[PDB]
Design a binder for this molecule. Structure first.
Ligand SMILES: [Mg+2]
Ligand SMILES: [Mg+2]
Lengths: 136, 76, 76, 198
RNA sequence: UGGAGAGUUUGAUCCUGGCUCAGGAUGAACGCUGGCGGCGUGCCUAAUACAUGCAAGUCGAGCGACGGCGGACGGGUGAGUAACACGUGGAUAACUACCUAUAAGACUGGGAUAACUUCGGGAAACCGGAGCUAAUACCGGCGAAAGUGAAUGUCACUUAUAGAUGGAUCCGCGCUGCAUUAGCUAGUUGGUAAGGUAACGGCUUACCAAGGCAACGAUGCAUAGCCGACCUGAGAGGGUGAUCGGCCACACUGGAACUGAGACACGGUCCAGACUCCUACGGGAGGCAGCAGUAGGGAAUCUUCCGCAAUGGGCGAAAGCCUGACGGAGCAACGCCGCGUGAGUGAUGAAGGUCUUCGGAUCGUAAAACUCUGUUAUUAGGGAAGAACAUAUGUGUAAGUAACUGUGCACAUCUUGACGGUACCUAAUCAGAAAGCCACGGCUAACUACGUGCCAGCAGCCGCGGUAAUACGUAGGUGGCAAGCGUUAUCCGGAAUUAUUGGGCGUAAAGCGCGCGUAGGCGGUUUUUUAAGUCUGAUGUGAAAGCCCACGGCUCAACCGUGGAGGGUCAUUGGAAACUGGAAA
């Protein structure tokens, strides 16, 4: 507004918040690295084999994996692709991005470098799922 | 006082110099006082000697120790 | 480990100045007692020796040379 | 970086009948693939500057990183960034080879440069994206007369520009002046080029 | 010089308004594939204990048989500190192993002792004792003083000068978030006193004295090294602090010193604490945020490489000597750049795939052949300008007495390249080894036939899926980029969505329930000064290096080189008085 008021208080701009909460900050030090920052990726360790549904009008079935992350906290997940060589308490790489119409799930289990290593059943969409073909 | 110095610059496999002067307390790479001009080491598609003795005599008055391979510039 | 021999000077150089300093000051601490009596016998011809040890702020350079005038600036 | 594959898909699917991947045509009722008078023709409002970006990119055989690195070389000229860009594409060593009639395409003009058979001023220049500065000439090495493919270009005269001295069999040239438009191209405005880059 | 948009609330509109996508980035990770010439950058998460190697010496023209200069420069790191830490301009109360310019004087007279053989104790760190000795070591008269050696010359000592160099210090301005934090320090504010360091000093103490700071942000919390620059942007701005330079602090932790020219000392030192480990359990040793390598939390960052030739630094008069500064190599698509996996010639829609009346099309001169080529490389070699010197020796500068000396002012010519049988380049059987990856409703660049068929799924939003479904896996087809393609998390633009350049309040979010009113903000007209703002002139300065404006050259180019523009809300140095401002009517 008035140039008198703008001297007396500047434009304190709009804060934003992260779309994906449970990563990427200095958390809660407890004389060791009790919890840390994972900007793109991490390890995991699993806790539960997941089976769930979307909720809005949709009626399909989905297979998450409710884990405890490497910084004491609890998140859901998802395995893209077909195969599932995963059981309880097995290491899984992470990468962010929510899943719409599921009520509370958080990230994608990377199908390349983990115990989630390689998914067969795919032949054209490949590097999104970690499937090889050394002929070409 | 001060010592006459060649700041080495230049990429991989290709040095190049700039004639400076500062005390030995100052290092080679930087905190250099003055520059009396460039110096041209390689002679292929490049000159071989370069100096400007106008502001070089300003430093031989209050004291200067040229290194014995730099003194071959100013003997020519 | 060639500072081992530098240590052997350091326990050896403490003896020469702290003998000179403690003799510099008690010649001067008795001097302002002798300058509180002023009979020209216990103050004369040793006050210039109290200034010779304040000239041995230049000879015994443990007391710094430019610091020669930190005590002797009042009596003489 | 080089474009290979002499199939007519560069001419027929773009549309223009230039001297690129095959000077003739044989499946003239159709476009490549099942895209044809049968099936979907996908047009756009940004495809009118796409096809003035895609119209040149296969012509010299250049990648995407080359044009943007040459779009702002015309920024060093006193004309605007879209005004002298076709001139700098007309001044490269590759399209001056085909302008001298010493090769038979612009792509054959890049083959006989890197293999040392065409030089500049005696010194071995083997760069197809070499900029021909004014006041320079075109050279060869001593083995350039035995080859049949230069003698192929001695058989047929191909293309005559206006900014050179024209020697189709002597294998030495002269860059007399900086070019202009409609000497090397014939069909492209300098106004639909620049709008793609915004 | 340069500045785009699309989608979604309704049965259908206009508006306000959010959320979401296309693009540029990463000292990124991770997903698939792999030809490199060449250039750069590779602890950002447990400040998690650090094996084994090398990083500080030099002087045999000191002097004996330790006396000097250097370890305060240099090379690592960000836990600390919201501050003269830093940036930027002003100021003098004073500080040099050095470097040098002239000149002085470089006298006189003494005596104690390491190494060394005996002496005894300890496993050790080693110590107590005794005979032996010089020293350029040590001592006396606003007052100290040195001598040394190849041909007296030379070279350090010593005092007063002043110049460069180097540090110190108070001062104007720039310096993050919060007011759901309003009071705050007491030797605090000041005189005075003597002591105190290079100097000023509440700099530390003593009697008196009643102040400091503050709503113009004083005090207290959590987060942080900071600038030149990097990122994005039309610009104004927003976000960042890495290699690369300047300044700063710190050394497993917490204090305190000693020598010297100007350390509270990274590799020294005495002490105290938590840890490792040995001894005869009486004691002693250890500090890789030096150069690398291992261990450790990790989704994540490399060789335990020869070596001083060039440039720079200590020591010496010189040969040279130690140099993990550095000159370079060993390894990862880590980033940009350049470059190939070929082209010229080559209609009968050859084999053959899923679509089809398979009455038929497509990829497709593609393939099959034919023809040249060998950047690149499956064959070895002659072989860098990068090295100018130093040393003297070839005979020149004055002291030439004396080109021996400091120089090397004829050359510096009997000399100096690990890398490097490198950069380069010729000659060979051979077009033969050398290409992916994501997408293809709408956006948004790119379509078809079945299997499953609100299922395995997919999804940036509209969502496509209840019996195939152009919007899921598959082959065909195409499009994009290309030795690289997508996905993630983060940051800026899109977002005129914090709007000074550039918004809003009747009903959409937003006008206090309304008066008197302190500080504050803004103030009609006239003339005259003042120059505080504003205007322009002048000087000095805001160092290299980057972006840009240009060029020999690396075969172009990335990078180097030279020039050029780029900082002042500043200090100071003159002119003008139009408005805003103090001053007279
Ligand atoms: Mg070191
Ligand atoms: Mg190094």
């Amino acid at each position: 507004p008035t140039i008198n008021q703008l001297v007396r208080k500047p434009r304190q701009s709009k804060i934003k918040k992260s779309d994906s909460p449970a990563l990427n900050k200095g958390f809660n030090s407890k004389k060791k690295k009790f919890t840390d920052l994972n900007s793109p990726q991490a390890r995991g360790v699993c806790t539960r084999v997941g089976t769930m549904t979307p909720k809005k009008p949709n009626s399909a079935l989905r297979k998450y994996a409710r884990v405890r992350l490497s910084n004491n906290i609890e998140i859901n997940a998802y395995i893209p692709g077909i195969g599932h060589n995963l059981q309880e308490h097995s290491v899984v790489l992470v990468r962010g991005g929510r899943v719409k119409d599921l009520p509370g799930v958080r990230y994608h289990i990377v199908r390349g470098a983990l115990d989630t290593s390689g998914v067969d059943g795919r032949r054209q969409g490949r590097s999104l799922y970690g499937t090889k073909k050394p002929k070409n | 006082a001060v010592k006459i110095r060649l700041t080495r610059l230049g990429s991989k496999r290709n040095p190049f110099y700039r004639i400076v002067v500062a005390d030995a307390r100052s290092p080679r790479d930087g905190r250099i006082i003055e520059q009396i001009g460039t110096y041209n080491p390689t002679s292929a598609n490049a000159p071989e000697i370069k100096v400007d003795e106008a502001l070089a005599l300003k430093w031989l008055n209050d004291g200067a120790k040229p290194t014995d391979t730099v003194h071959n510039i100013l003997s020519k | 480990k060639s500072a081992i021999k530098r240590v052997k000077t350091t326990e050896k150089a403490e003896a020469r100045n702290i003998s000179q300093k403690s003799a510099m000051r008690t010649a001067v601490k008795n001097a302002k007692t002798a300058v509180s009596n002023n009979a020209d016998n216990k103050n004369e011809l040793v006050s210039l020796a109290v200034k010779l040890v304040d000239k041995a702020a230049q000879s015994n350079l443990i007391h710094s040379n430019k610091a020669d005038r930190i005590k002797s600036q009042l009596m003489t | 970086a080089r474009f290979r594959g002499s199939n007519w898909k560069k001419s027929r699917r773009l549309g223009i009948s230039l001297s690129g991947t095959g000077k003739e045509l044989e499946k003239r009722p159709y476009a490549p693939g099942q895209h044809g008078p049968n099936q979907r023709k996908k047009l756009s409002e940004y495809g009118l500057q796409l096809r003035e970006k895609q119209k040149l990119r296969y012509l010299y055989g250049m990648t995407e990183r080359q044009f943007r690195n040459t779009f702002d070389i015309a920024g060093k000229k006193f004309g605007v960034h879209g005004e002298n860009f076709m001139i700098l594409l007309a001044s490269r060593l590759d399209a001056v080879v085909y302008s001298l009639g010493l090769a038979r395409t612009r792509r054959q003009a890049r083959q006989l440069v890197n293999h040392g058979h065409i030089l500049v001023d005696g010194k071995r220049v083997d760069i197809p994206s070499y900029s021909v500065k004014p006041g320079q000439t075109i050279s060869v090495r001593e083995k350039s007369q035995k080859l049949n493919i230069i003698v192929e270009s001695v058989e047929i005269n191909n293309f005559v520009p206006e900014y050179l001295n024209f020697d189709a069999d002597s294998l030495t040239g002269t860059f007399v002046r900086l070019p202009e438009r409609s000497e090397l191209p014939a069909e492209i405005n300098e106004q639909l080029i620049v709008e793609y880059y915004s």
